[PDB]
Amino acid sequence: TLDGGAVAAPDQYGAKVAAEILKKGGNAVDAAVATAFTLAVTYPEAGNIGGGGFMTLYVDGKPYFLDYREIAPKAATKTMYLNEKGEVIENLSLVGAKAAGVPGTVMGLWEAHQRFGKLKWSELLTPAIGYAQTGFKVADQQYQYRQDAIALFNGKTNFGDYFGTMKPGEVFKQPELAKTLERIADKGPDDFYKGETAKLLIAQMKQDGGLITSDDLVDYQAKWREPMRIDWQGNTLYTAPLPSSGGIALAQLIGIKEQRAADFKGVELNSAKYIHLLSEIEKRVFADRADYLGDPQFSKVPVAQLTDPKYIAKRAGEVNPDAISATEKVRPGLEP
Amino acid sequence: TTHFSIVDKDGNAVSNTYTLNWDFGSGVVVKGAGFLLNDEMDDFSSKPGVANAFGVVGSDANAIEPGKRMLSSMSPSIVTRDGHVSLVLGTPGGSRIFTSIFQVLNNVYDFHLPLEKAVAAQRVHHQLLPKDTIYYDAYAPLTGKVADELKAMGYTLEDQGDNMGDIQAIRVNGKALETASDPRGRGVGMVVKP
């Protein structure tokens, strides 16, 4: 088949770990699980076990998609981020415990591995545990993001208790995170959603006034979904369906650009004409994004209608190649 | 947010985007456990027509409800041709994620640029609201004649204050593998031989 495997990772540690797993005979999923836990240590600004995400896969010639996006706590309400007079409360949805959805990453990595991985679960966490125990060197830009974040948090959280000792180019260790990963390696997701880690999560919600409960954690499920499929020019793109907007967005971006090929003929990449045409398409994509898209089991989302080739053709017609279309006139495309 | 891409020697592929939402999420660490909690709730529409931290709006579909998943822009992607993986890619960037991927795909498939150049190339973003506003990053800012021409058309140009993505991609060319890590970030790629 191929000359080998490959990894493209957002830091050197994820790259190294993925490569070691491939060398040991793990498949792409084994490597992905070990990489995701590694970055939960070395890339805490985004790599995580307290967040969520999406995995797109191609295994033995077939496409798959795994949704481990966070879910609103049972106690969430439509106006929970508004004051008694209806105004949005500054940063209540962005900073502090009420900003958190129920985390899905540990469940997602488990489900992906149980279905498709080749190697023993616990050993996929040993790399990450090592980096948490013996540390990694903080990057310059990473520390800058740390500075910006701690200034934004403005003393409202316990962030500084755990990440305040980060210094650029110095080794940063995370002993409590090491133990948490050891529990996940030994017990599986049960530790996070039912066990010791789950208890520690609940205690933090009570300490900080958050909403997540034990029942929230016990009821969390990752979901396998049919990936979004987009075909053009003999290529087949598999990407994220709802609850991601990217699948429908890409289906419309590619489909409309193809319909407007004549306008793109001859125009150099990142010319003002190129950029204007992309903006004109993006106008219509985001008009539909705002009006129709959300969790697909909580409303009847007209996905087919928004990706039918005839709809794509109608929306492509709206593109104005010579001038900006009137923003207030860019409507949701299925609006009667 | 962050993204990684993996292909194994059997031709299987994983494209994985995951996140806390904003940098270090909510800033809340689980005492005793040591991990940060997300601030992913801001991806819901908190109030109809009111933009969230990425400038995107919503109403009923993306309104908060118990047990509901909040709308995402994360778009981990795998391109195939003739039943075989040909390109694995994804990126952070909030509401810029799928427009950045769109541009990389245009660079690879329409402009036929080599992978490293397609990923390093300037990317910009528009999203209807804010009105006629095009975003750029300090890595490859809009400048010179093109910026004047866009300004003259009626567009507002704005430095968004962070890099526009961090593409991590793998191209499969027959049996050969190529990686690209966005120069905007500190990523690393490796081809791994049996």
Q: Which domain holds residue A298?
A: 227-336
Does residue B191 belong to any structural domain of this protein?
A: no
**B128 shares a domain with B118:** yes
B73 vs B63: CA distance, rounded Å: 16
CA nearest neighbour of B181 among A295, A157, A14, A144: A14
- Residues of chain A with C-beta less than 8 angstroms from the C-beta of B92: 46
- Give the other-Cβ count within 10 Å of B10's Cβ: 13
- To test the contact with chain A by mutation, choose from B3, B17, B47, B68 the residue with the greatest count of A C-beta atoms within 10 A, namely B68
Q: What sign does the dihedral A208-A214-A217-A219 (CA atoms) show? A: negative
User: Within 13 A of A162's CA, how many CA atoms are on the CB side?
Assistant: 24
Instruction: Give the method used.
Output: X-ray
Structure tokens at B135: 């975003």
**Which of A63, A286, A269 lies closest to B112, judged by CA?**
A269
Q: Are residues B26 and B94 in the same domain?
A: no
Q: Tell whether A212 and A244 lie within a shared domain.
A: no
Residue B139 counted as domain residue: yes
Tell me the sheet residues that pair with B81: B84
- Give me the torsion for CA of A24, A30, A34, A35, rounded to 10°: 100
* CA end-to-end span of chain A: 51
Are A122 and A185 in contact, with CB atoms under 8 Å apart? Answer: yes
Q: Coil, strand or helix: which one is A52?
A: strand
Based on the fold, state whether residues A219 and A244 are members of the same structural domain.
Answer: no
Q: Same domain for A253 and A134?
A: no
Task: Say how far apart CA A12 and CA A26 lie, in whole Å.
Answer: 19
Instruction: Tell me the two tokens of residue A46.
Output: 């985004």
Cα distance between residue A284 and residue A298, in whole Å: 24
Single out the residue in A188, A203, A226 at which a domain terminates: A226
Same domain, A170 and A251: no
Using the 3D structure, point to which of B72, B88, B114 is the last residue of a domain.
B72
B161 CA: distance to closest CA in chain A (Å): 12
CB neighbour list of residue B58: distance below 8 Å, 6 or more residues apart: A290, A293, A294, B44, B45, B48, B71
Do both B155 and B97 map to the same domain? yes
Examine residue B169 and state whether it is found in any structural domain, yes or no: yes
Position B9 in a domain? yes
Q: B181 and B142 share a domain?
A: yes
Q: What is the DSSP string of A175-226?
A: HHHHHHHHHHHHHTHHHHHTSHHHHHHHHHHHHHT----HHHHHH---EEEP
Whether the CB-CB separation of A252 and A261 falls below 8 Å is answered with: no
Residue A138's identity, in one-letter code, is: V
- Are B93 and B157 part of one and the same domain? yes
Are A319 and A280 within 8 A, CB to CB? yes
> Are B25 and B111 in a shared domain?
no
| Structure-block tokens of residue A115 | 């279905």
Q: Which residues pair with A244 in a beta bridge?
A: B72
Shared domain check, B158 and B97: yes
Closest CA to A5 of B94, B32, B11, B21: B11
Residue B141 sits in the same domain as residue B177: yes
**Residue among A168, A166, A171, A184 at smallest CA distance from A128:** A184
Same domain, A21 and A141: yes
The last residue of a domain, from among A208, A226, A244: A226
Last residue of a domain, one of A182, A210, A226: A226
Residues in chain B: 194
Q: Is residue B131 part of a domain?
A: yes
Q: Are B10 and B28 members of one domain?
A: no
CA atoms of B108 and A100, how far apart (whole Å) = 37
Residues 29-68 of A with CB under 8 A from B: 29, 31-32, 35-36, 39-40, 43-61, 63, 67-68
CA distance A114 to chain B (A): 15
Look at the block and give the residue holding tokens 């009847």. Answer: A300
For the question of residue B19 being annotated catalytic, the response is no
A 10 A CB-CB count for A124 gives: 27
Whether residue A155 sits in one domain with residue A96: yes
Helix (H) / strand (E) containing A272: helix A272-292
Structure tokens at A3: 């000359």
B55 and B82 share a domain? Answer: no
Rounded Cα distance between A51 and A45, Å, is 11
Region of residue B22 (phi > 0: left; psi between -120 and 50: alpha; otherwise: beta)? beta
Q: Is A323 exposed, middle or buried (0-12, 13-18, 19+ CB in 10 A)?
A: exposed
**Residue A87 neighbours by CB under 8 Å, 6+ apart:** none
CA angle A115, A120, A123 (to 5 degrees): 130
Two tokens, residue B151: 């300004």
Distance CA A27, CA A18 (A): 10
Say how many domains are in chain A. Answer: 2
Q: How many Cα atoms are found within 13 Å in the side-chain-facing hemisphere of A240? A: 33
CA–CA dist A197, B33 (Å, integer)? 6
Instruction: Report d(CA A283, CA A277) in Å as an integer.
Output: 10
For residues A228 and A239, what is the distance between their CA atoms, to the nearest angstrom?
A: 5
CATH code where residue B90 lies: 3.60.20.40
Helix-helix angle A28-42:A175-187, to 10 degrees: 150
Handedness of CA B172, A29, A214, A299 (dihedral sign): positive
Is B193 domain-assigned? no
Q: Structurally, how many domains does chain B consist of?
A: 2
Contact present, B4 and A12 (Cβ < 8 Å): no
Q: Are residues B95 and B124 in the same domain?
A: yes
Under 8 Å between Cβ of B101 and B75: yes
What is the Cα–Cα distance from A277 to A319, expressed in whole angstroms? 7
User: Are A222 and A238 members of one domain?
Assistant: no
Peptide bond into A302 cis (omega under 30): no
B49 lies in a domain? yes
Nearest to A161 by CA among A150, A145, A147, A148: A150
Give the residue among B112, B96, B93 at the shortest CA–CA distance from B173. Answer: B112
Query: Measured between alpha carbons, how far is residue B119 from residues A43, A170, A309, B174, B180 in Å?
Result: 21, 30, 29, 20, 7
Q: How far is CA A124 from the centre of its chain?
A: 21
C-beta separation of A316 from A272 below 8 A: no
Given a contact cutoff of 8 angstroms between Cβ atoms, the answer to whether B130 and B102 are in contact is no
B39 neighbourhood in chain A, CB within 8 Å: 93-95, 99-100
Judge if A197 and A212 occupy the same domain: yes
Structure token digits, residue B21: 């939402």
* B194 lies in some domain: no
- Is any Cβ of chain B less than 8 angstroms from the Cβ of A154? no
| Nearest of A202, A209, A130 to residue A171 by alpha carbon | A130
d(CA B150, CA B70): 34
Cα–Cα separations (whole angstroms), residue A218 to A84, A320, B30: 32, 51, 18
DSSP sequence for chain B: -EEEEEE-TTS-EEEEEEE-SSTTTTS-B-TTT--BPP-GGGGSBSSTT---TTS---SSTTB--TTPBPPB----EEEEETTEEEEEE----GGGHHHHHHHHHHHHHTS---HHHHHHS---EE-SSSTTEEEE-TTS---HHHHHHHHHHT-EEEE-SS-S---EEEEEETTEEEEEE-TTTT-EEEEE--
Do A25 and A39 have their domain in common?
yes
Domain that holds residue B57: 20-72
Do both B115 and B151 map to the same domain? Answer: yes
